Design goal:
part of a larger assembly; 4 chains; A mainly beta; B alpha/beta; C alpha/beta; A: mainly beta; two-stranded antiparallel ribbon; 2 strands; 22% strand; B: two-stranded antiparallel sheet; 13 helices; DNA-directed RNA polymerase subunit beta'' (chain D); gene regulation; Transcription; chloroplast; RNA polymerase
Chain lengths: 49, 374, 114, 42
């Protein structure tokens, strides 16, 4: 909304009457032909490709 | 009366002598002092920007472009002359310094007792530094000086405390402002209630007060703020910033400060080293964001005397910019000058040796801050 | 086979009390210091030199305020560095000094007042 | 077995499993007749 602060990146984890809890997430842009290293929901540690 | 306006520093002139002493939980090797510099770049919180004797503030104030006079007593021996020659070299006025030819400078006669199976000492004869009399005050200095500065070390001496309040009466009669730089010595950290009673009379006489974050929390409630810093939400943070687990820079509300506020107080400054300068006025309050970098010079860094440079920088701008008391934007810009002075003071071994000049301080301020904050 | 690098001994409050209560013939110099205090680095080097000059004509000891904080406060320590000069004559009162005093000043106290 | 053995009483984070991750405040944050009443009916 115009009268509201901008949102942060992440997934909506909790929905309540007048507030929302967000789990922090970072998006990465990838072009066609790129390769993703890992299945869905695969745990990635810091520094992993 | 020449410009810039004169400032008077009252108390004991000493070489180094950090007064604020508490218990740290991270000691280095007891003999290998080459390891002790690691505590200069990871200091105890009470020692992030240590203060010192009032002569440090006077010397630092002059190097920053001001004019200062020291009021106190030294002995007639050789060490007394060295202290006076130190202040004359730094162009600090010494007409207010009185000589006691029958006393030894910085020497206290004490007697050792063995009460209840423990060793204690009691003072037999105070040193000349703590024995200035009211009849020895230089009234020409107190008439000219616009800021009267003193520490709480004078409250540990019965003679100086009586002399202190006569000096304050004269200074107020001549329109001078009273600057109370707390710098609690070791005895005054024993208990909150005894210390508050000891400092209450001098606290009420002050127009400007500088305290550290540790001193302020000790005077109000030490355990409440320690619990406040250690609180962590159980499930999720209340806001995105609380997730970053950053250092705590809590800004005390004016209602928390209210037990320490009085009618004549114009400016209260709470220093978190050089990192934060919380300021409080009757009309407004806020915080100046600062910084520190002692790791840029790991082998010459020494935080001793940096608290005196910050205080000297405040007095340098207060005398020349009287609108700091009423304008918040002006006050914040001038306090950034004091932040820069504290930063430079931490880059040299020795307090007096490392006190910065005005042009060096102004240069660092413009280098650190973006031009809109100058 | 290897000479020790440091002459000044660190003593507990209990050990210092017995040393003061016991019989002494040489002047006793007690140093209060803390490893976090910047000026104590300079004072530590001066007292090691003082120990070399006064081989057996004086006894130089040091006490850490991080370990004996309550003891230091009872001894009227108002800050660091602080030195106590205790005479072997029990009637004479001790001399407490504050700040980084010169090495020559220490010698004058030991020779003329101790 | 216990009898073959050869201290004397007389003297945050939420687990996410599917592989384990811990969820806490470091990665989750908040963005801010008679009258009928809710309750049992029997």
């Amino acid at each position: 909304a115009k009268k509201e602060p901008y949102l942060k990146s992440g997934q909506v984890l909790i929905v309540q009457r007048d507030s929302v809890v967000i789990r922090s997430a970072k998006p990465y842009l990838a072009t066609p032909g790129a390769k993703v290293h890992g299945h869905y929901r695969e745990i990635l540690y810091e520094g992993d490709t | 009366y020449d410009d810039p306006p004169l400032v008077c520093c009252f108390g004991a002139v000493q070489k180094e002598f950090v007064p604020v002493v508490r218990v740290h939980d991270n000691p280095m090797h007891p003999d290998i002092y080459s390891q002790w510099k690691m505590l200069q770049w990871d200091p105890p919180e009470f020692g992030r920007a240590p203060g010192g004797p009032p002569s440090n503030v006077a010397i630092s104030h002059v190097r920053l472009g001001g004019r200062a006079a020291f009021m106190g007593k030294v002995g007639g021996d050789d060490y007394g002359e060295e202290l006076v020659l130190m202040m004359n070299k730094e162009r600090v006025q010494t007409r207010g310094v009185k000589f006691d030819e029958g006393a030894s400078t910085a020497c206290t006669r004490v007697k050792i007792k063995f009460e209840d199976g423990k060793m204690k000492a009691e003072t037999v004869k105070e040193p000349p530094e703590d024995s200035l009399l009211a009849s020895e005050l230089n009234l020409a200095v107190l008439k000219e000086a616009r800021i009267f500065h003193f520490n709480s070390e004078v409250l540990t001496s019965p003679t100086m405390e009586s002399t202190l309040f006569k000096a304050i009466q004269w200074s107020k009669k001549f329109g001078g402002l009273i600057f109370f730089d707390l710098n609690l010595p070791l005895p005054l950290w024993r208990s909150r209630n005894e210390t508050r009673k000891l400092i209450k009379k001098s606290w009420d006489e002050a127009n400007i007060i500088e305290v550290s974050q540790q001193e302020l929390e000790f005077l109000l409630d030490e355990e409440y703020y320690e619990r406040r810093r250690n609180y962590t939400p159980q499930y999720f943070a209340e806001d995105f910033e609380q997730t970053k687990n950053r250092r705590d820079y809590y800004h005390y509300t004016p209602e928390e400060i209210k037990p320490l506020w009085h009618d004549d107080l114009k400016l209260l400054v709470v220093t978190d080293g050089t990192l934060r300068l919380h300021y409080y006025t009757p009309k407004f309050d806020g915080v100046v964001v600062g910084t520190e970098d002692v790791l840029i010079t790991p082998f010459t860094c020494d935080r001793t005397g940096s608290g005196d440079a910050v205080v000297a920088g405040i007095m340098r701008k207060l005398t020349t910019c009287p609108e700091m008391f009423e304008d918040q934007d002006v006050l914040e810009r001038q306090l950034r000058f004091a932040v820069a002075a504290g930063i430079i003071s931490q880059w040299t071994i020795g307090a007096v040796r490392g006190f910065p000049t005005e042009s060096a301080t102004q240069n660092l301020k413009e280098q650190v801050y973006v031009p809109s904050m100058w | 086979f290897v000479r020790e690098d440091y002459l000044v001994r660190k003593l507990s409050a209990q050990e210092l009390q017995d040393l003061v209560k016991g019989e002494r013939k040489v002047p006793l110099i007690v140093d209060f210091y803390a490893t976090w205090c910047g000026p104590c680095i300079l004072m530590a080097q001066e007292l090691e030199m003082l120990a070399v000059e006064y081989e057996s004509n004086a006894m130089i000891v040091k006490v850490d305020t991080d370990d004996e904080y309550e003891f230091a406060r009872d001894m009227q320590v108002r800050g660091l560095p602080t030195l106590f000069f205790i005479s072997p004559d029990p009637s004479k009162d001790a001399i407490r000094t504050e700040g980084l005093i010169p090495l020559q000043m220490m010698r004058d106290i030991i020779d003329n007042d101790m | 077995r216990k009898r073959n053995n050869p201290m004397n009483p007389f003297y945050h984070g939420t687990i996410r499993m599917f592989s384990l991750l811990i969820l806490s405040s470091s990665n989750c944050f908040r963005i801010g007749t008679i009258k009928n009443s809710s309750g049992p009916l029997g």
